[PDB]
Homo-oligomer: A and B are copies of this chain.
Amino acid sequence: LADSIVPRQQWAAIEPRRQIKMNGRADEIFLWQTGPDTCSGCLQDSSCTEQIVKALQDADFKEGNDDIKYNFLIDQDGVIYEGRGWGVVGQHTKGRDSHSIGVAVIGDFGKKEPSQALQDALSKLIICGQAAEELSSGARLRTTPAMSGQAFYDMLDRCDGLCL
């Protein structure tokens, strides 16, 4: 908490091969998980989650995407990573990328719920985005078990949103 969002240059990101500007404020936030297999310890590691971001971008390329598919990413220790950033249409939620923000939580949460550190980072990213008119003040957080993992989904269901 209290740090800055890690910019594209910190994790040595490649310029995108195409960047489509978003038509004003996003009013939705789609939460996805990178997967229990992301590894291809380093759940926090010593700045290991930073090369994972770099890698995810590389993966997203071979897949035909214009750049890493998410607008932001968050690791289990609470550090936020700038993906496509604010104002750019991502390629994360088929057919719904145009007016939403796509966030990816690094790791799998099909069995274990997210750390309070990760949850806090997410709440922060939302509050700050809204403060700066990047996100609509009513933006709903959307996800499903298939998207962010049963453990993550179950948690939002219990705390009617992020816990505490």
Most chain B CB inside 10 Å of its own CB: which residue of A2, A125, A126, A130: A2
Once bound together, how far apart are the Cα atoms of A4 and B133, in whole Å?
Answer: 5
User: 9 closest A-B pairs (Cβ-Cβ)?
Assistant: A128-B128, A4-B133, A2-B137, A2-B130, A128-B131, A5-B131, A3-B137, A4-B131, A4-B130
Residues of B within 8 A of A128 (CB): 124, 127-128, 131-132
Residues of B within 8 A of A133 (CB): 4-5, 7
Residues of B within 8 A of A2 (CB): 126-127, 130, 137-138
Contact size class for A? 10 to 19
A80 interface residue (CB < 8 Å to B)? yes
Once bound together, how far apart are the Cα atoms of A27 and B55, in whole Å?
Answer: 33
Once bound together, how far apart are the Cα atoms of A131 and B133, in whole Å?
Answer: 15
Most chain B CB inside 10 Å of its own CB: which residue of A4, A128, A131: A131
Q: In whole Å, how far is A161's beta carbon from the nearest beta carbon of chain B?
A: 11
A1 interface residue (CB < 8 Å to B)? yes
Q: Which of B1, B80, B130, B138 sits near A127, CB closer than 8 Å?
A: B1
Residues of B within 8 A of A138 (CB): 2
Residues of B within 8 A of A5 (CB): 131-133
| B130 x A3 contact (CB < 8 A) | yes
Which residues of A (109-148) have their CB < 8 Å from a CB of B?
Answer: 124-128, 130-133, 137-138
Q: Which of B7, B80, B124, B131 sits near A3, CB closer than 8 Å?
A: B131
Once bound together, how far apart are the Cα atoms of A126 and B4, in whole Å?
Answer: 11
